[PDB]
């Protein structure tokens, strides 16, 4: 059959993980389910044995005065009157139900990567006096305010949000201070040029470093709405590459189809079929909402976009568009996972944080392949099969060390009939033989003893 | 103060008490079986008799993991590997289970025990990363434990189910089932290392295996018999995803004490404690030392009132040897059995606080008295009085708020102390109030009985 030979001596990017968000009170929607529904939603998102095994949670650092509509209330919703005054913190022990989701992810399911991102400063820190409708942080170049220079205050505020999480037994590992900085919206939004982002990183970095935080989070930038948009910010960011450690971008205004010129890992932090009528299907005709489509979208972001992580926009939510992976039926108190959840899971269950992408060769026409060596030495080989059932042999290169060689193998597939379902893996003399199902994503894993 | 009045408020309730007990694992049951017939009967009586012994209501058995009965090892029902987990397991039943089946049959059919907790300390060696039931190692096929020989997770679930079926076919119902013991500890004897995450992983496999089995009674899954409260409490977060698939939290009292309530929806049992290394003593009170009956009466109190425990098991019941690892001493040469006052301390609880009792509020204790109260399923109310002072005149009553048909029509009392082993004392009863002289340095239990069916 087809023989796929993994070359562990040819390496690419590290994989930090896969995930999603419950921002904008999507966590509050989850919190209103019955106990059994809450548990099923958390399980299908985070379970490493019986769900998607998502390894990254992205939270919003709320900017709004209250929890009206779907707004994320800020930890400091009321102005202290001057940026020279201590901020007025009113920690509610909830953070828009994101603290609960985070505690479950970390303490119940073993998630270790928590990305907190502000879509805006509080309104009193901004040129327009409002967390919505754009505007900029007071005190940046070209943004003087009568009320004062709020740059250090905003750095102190973000540091305090991370401290509140720490005191609630959750370590925020990555910290963002803008989202879609190129776009004014009717909801939480804030306009920074790439230059202003560099200016603010020079203030935020020493604030974190001098803080009493147990773990100093890595600063991220800038959650632009597409690859091209974020790539256009990298020149101005290059002066501060010693002071941040993660580039973030979405997949809306352009696709993750090229390697960005940055020394940092690059995460694709939001993608979705936002407008698409709800479908739970794996494959029907290759539509934009189909699980098969999203298995390939992830492949493309990793192999062509050089992404180290891939986050779907929203995990569990109500509504009937493909903006989310897991449908909440608030009436029945029920939870329905789409095959998009299982697409992201077919990746995340087997390609764990700290994996290194490695060369695989031998694929035929109708197979797209990628390989990853996990920190534990397990070698996950992804096979996306656009044809009929295919006999595939998976092995390491001749030149592989005996300590890298597998003593056992397993395989799982997602297709129309399967949700990360274990399939037979014949194992003889370092070689795993699997029948990759028609129109499936199959992951074959080679385990050392 | 016409004595100290203890007033029970039946409207204020706490946890249920499932019972009190011990184990005869690691061939301690074999040591009992070697006694002359009268010695066997005396050992069984002092453990289980509800009239003339400690009335222990729970037995904890080991699910043997060893390839043979060398040393004190518990031989497995499946000591020989089938080579591969695709192959049916090879069951080699000996009709004995390291003499635990006999102790169980006597407990259930002679003495009325209804709760039988079977716990594996290891899978058989051939199912593990180290190929041995001792020296730790992990079940093959769990996350972080892939084995050349295969994935033995389903096999181990099938094996545990089959152990329960062999008991069922020998007319004993296993009510509770554990699959690890001290999962944080590697030892030179039966031992197996699981993280809390691995335990949750295995529960997701074991639960449906039990539910689809042909067992007459589906036992409740327990976890995880950690060596202390702190160690077990640290496992609860990873276990919380499978709270719909198990029903009992278990922990020991070695590496920390049962001094706080665990955050779990399940009943919590303290399934092993002992003065393991203390020189044998049979005494109730000498100075408050680690082996004394008085100290163990207080350890039970603390586990129930401060630990929120629903059950309390001493490590071993009857055993040979010269330490306080056990409650009842066997002299294999004399063929004799000698209960310590630790046996009588646990019986001073278990005789009167029967399975299903609900802990209830009691007020009025003076400085020398520690008190707790329990409403039994039959409406009888057991009031424990632990008295560190001289003889204490005490009155025991229900709160005036009580329905007149909850109010006792009779009362009895028993005490354990340096001279008494669960000995009846006077409970003078007038107009719903029991009056007792609680002896110096004793544990006394006063029971208020409603009239019930009696004219
Ligand atoms: C000290 O230790 C105590 C334990 O020893 C501990 O007590 C525990 O307290 C918590 C918190 O108060 C209690 O949690 C509540 O539980 C309610 C359900 O309780 C009933 O079901 C339980 C589980 O039953 C399963 O397991 C048993 C054995 O495994 C079986 O006997 C059962 O058949 C059943 O098995 C089935 O299900 C299993 C999975 O669960 C499955 O594996 C199995 O195969 C099978 O299919 C019982 O244990 C419990 O029994 C108690 O109560 C009965 C009746 O009084 C007694 O007779 C018993 O002796 C025993 O004491 C019950 O039968 C939940 O409903 C409740 O959740 C609701 O409320 C919360 C908020 O508190 C809401 O967030 C939630 O959404 C729920 O809301 C619903 O109900 C409310 C009504 O109040 C309503 O307003 C709302 O709209 C909605 O409808 C909560 O989870 C827990 O039960 C206690 N345990 C026990 C054993 O009592 C105590 O806290 C400790 N103290 C301290 C200080 O820490
Ligand atoms: C893909 O992304 C990785 C980062 O995830 C890039 O790795 C960097 O490569 C440069 C140039 O060789 C090194 O000096 C950096 O130290 C690397 N960063 C890390 C964190 O490893 C890699 O260059 C990217 N690939 C392409 C084709 O652009
Ligand atoms: O510029 C026009 C484009 O269509 C954008 O609006 C798209 C792609 O860049 O942007 C996306 O719009 C929808 C956003 O979702 C919402 O977030 C706020 C919340 O209150 C709403 O309920 C959501 O619909 C998404 O964040 C954004 O990337
Ligand atoms: O880590 C060191 C500690 O002292 C542990 O050894 C203690 C308390 O955690 O653990 C206890 O050690 C003795 C064990 O009893 C033995 O069980 C196996 C049997 O073969 C032996 O004869 C017994 O001594 C006890 O189970 C354990 O809790
Ligand atoms: O490894 C396999 C798991 O991936 C599988 O998980 C299931 C995925 O589909 C969901 O609908 C189920 O709830 C979940 O259990 O279970 C089998 C296991 O071998
Ligand atoms: O109710 C009382 C029993 O608890 C008591 O049991 C005795 C306890 O001490 C043991 O040494 C004896 O063998 C045992 O009979 O017996 C008297 C009864 O009133």
UniProtKB/Swiss-Prot annotation, chain B:
<dbReference type="GO" id="GO:0005576">
    <property type="term" value="C:extracellular region"/>
</dbReference>
<dbReference type="Pfam" id="PF14587">
    <property type="entry name" value="Glyco_hydr_30_2"/>
</dbReference>
<dbReference type="GO" id="GO:0006680">
    <property type="term" value="P:glucosylceramide catabolic process"/>
</dbReference>
<comment type="similarity">
    <text>Belongs to the glycosyl hydrolase 30 family.</text>
</comment>
<protein>
    <recommendedName>
        <fullName>GH30 family xylanase</fullName>
        <ecNumber>3.2.1.-</ecNumber>
    </recommendedName>
</protein>
<dbReference type="InterPro" id="IPR039514">
    <property type="entry name" value="6GAL-like"/>
</dbReference>
<feature type="glycosylation site" description="N-linked (GlcNAc...) asparagine">
    <location>
        <position position="214"/>
    </location>
</feature>
<dbReference type="GO" id="GO:0004348">
    <property type="term" value="F:glucosylceramidase activity"/>
</dbReference>
<dbReference type="InterPro" id="IPR017853">
    <property type="entry name" value="Glycoside_hydrolase_SF"/>
</dbReference>
<dbReference type="InterPro" id="IPR001139">
    <property type="entry name" value="Glyco_hydro_30"/>
</dbReference>
<keyword id="KW-0378">Hydrolase</keyword>
<keyword id="KW-0732">Signal</keyword>
<feature type="glycosylation site" description="N-linked (GlcNAc...) asparagine">
    <location>
        <position position="171"/>
    </location>
</feature>
<keyword id="KW-0325">Glycoprotein</keyword>
<dbReference type="GO" id="GO:0016020">
    <property type="term" value="C:membrane"/>
</dbReference>
<keyword id="KW-0964">Secreted</keyword>
<comment type="function">
    <text>Xylanase exhibiting endo- and exo-xylanase activity. Shows the highest activity toward beechwood glucuronoxylan, which consists of a beta-1,4-linked xylose backbone decorated with the methylated form of D-glucuronic acid (MeGlcA) attached directly to the main chain at xylose C2. Also acts against wheat arabinoxylan, a xylan without MeGlcA substituents along the main chain, but the xylanase activity is about two orders of magnitude lower than that achieved in the case of beechwood xylan. Shows no activity against carob galactomannan, konjac glucomannan, or barley beta-glucan.</text>
</comment>
<feature type="glycosylation site" description="N-linked (GlcNAc...) asparagine">
    <location>
        <position position="308"/>
    </location>
</feature>
<dbReference type="InterPro" id="IPR013780">
    <property type="entry name" value="Glyco_hydro_b"/>
</dbReference>
<dbReference type="Pfam" id="PF17189">
    <property type="entry name" value="Glyco_hydro_30C"/>
</dbReference>
<dbReference type="InterPro" id="IPR033452">
    <property type="entry name" value="GH30_C"/>
</dbReference>
């Amino acid at each position: 059959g087809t023989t796929l030979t993994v070359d562990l001596s040819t390496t690419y990017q590290r994989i930090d993980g896969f995930g999603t968000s419950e921002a904008f009170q999507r966590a509050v929607q989850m919190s209103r389910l019955p106990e059994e529904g809450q548990r099923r939603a958390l399980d299908v998102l985070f379970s490493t044995t019986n769900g998607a095994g998502l390894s990254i949670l992205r939270n919003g650092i709320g900017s709004s005065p209250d929890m009206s509509s779907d707004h994320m209330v800020s930890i400091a919703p009321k102005s202290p009157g001057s940026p020279n005054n201590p901020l007025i913190y009113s920690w509610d022990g909830s953070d828009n139900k994101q603290l609960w989701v985070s505690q479950e992810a970390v303490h119940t399911y073993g998630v270790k990567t928590i990305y907190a991102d502000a879509w805006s400063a509080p309104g009193y820190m901004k040129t327009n006096g409002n967390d919505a409708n754009g505007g900029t942080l007071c005190g940046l170049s070209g943004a003087q305010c009568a009320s004062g220079d709020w740059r250090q205050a905003y750095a102190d505020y973000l540091t305090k949000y991370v401290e509140f999480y720490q005191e609630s037994n959750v370590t925020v590992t990555h910290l963002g201070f803008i989202n879609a900085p190129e776009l004014t919206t009717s909801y939480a939004s804030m306009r920074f040029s790439a230059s202003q982002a560099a200016e603010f990183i020079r203030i935020l970095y020493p604030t974190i470093q001098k803080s009493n935080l147990t773990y100093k989070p890595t600063i991220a930038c800038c959650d632009a709405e597409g690859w091209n948009s974020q790539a256009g910010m990298l020149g101005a960011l290059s002066s501060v590459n010693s002071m941040f450690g993660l580039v973030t971008a979405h997949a809306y205004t352009s696709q993750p189809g090229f390697s960005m010129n940055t020394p940092h890992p690059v995460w694709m932090t939001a993608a979705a079929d936002l407008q698409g009528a709800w479908t739970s299907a794996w494959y029907s005709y290759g539509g934009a909402g189909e699980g098969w489509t999203w298995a390939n979208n992830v492949y493309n972001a990793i192999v062509n976009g050089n992404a180290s992580a891939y986050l779907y926009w929203i995990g569990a939510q109500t509504g009937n568009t493909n903006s989310h992976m897991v449908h909440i039926d608030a009436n029945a108190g029920t939870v329905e996972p789409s095959k998009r959840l299982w697409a992201l899971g077919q990746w995340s269950r087997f390609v764990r944080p700290g994996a290194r992408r490695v060369a695989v060769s031998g694929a035929s026409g109708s197979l797209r392949t990628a390989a990853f060596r996990n920190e534990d030495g397990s070698v996950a080989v992804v096979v996306i099969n656009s044809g009929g059932d295919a006999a595939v042999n998976v092995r390491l290169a001749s030149s592989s060390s005996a300590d890298q060689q597998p003593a056992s193998a397993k395989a799982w597939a997602t297709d129309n009939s399967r949700a990360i379902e274990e399939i037979q893996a014949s194992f003889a003399d370092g070689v795993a033989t699997v029948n990759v199902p028609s129109r499936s994503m199959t992951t074959v894993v080679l385990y050392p003893a």
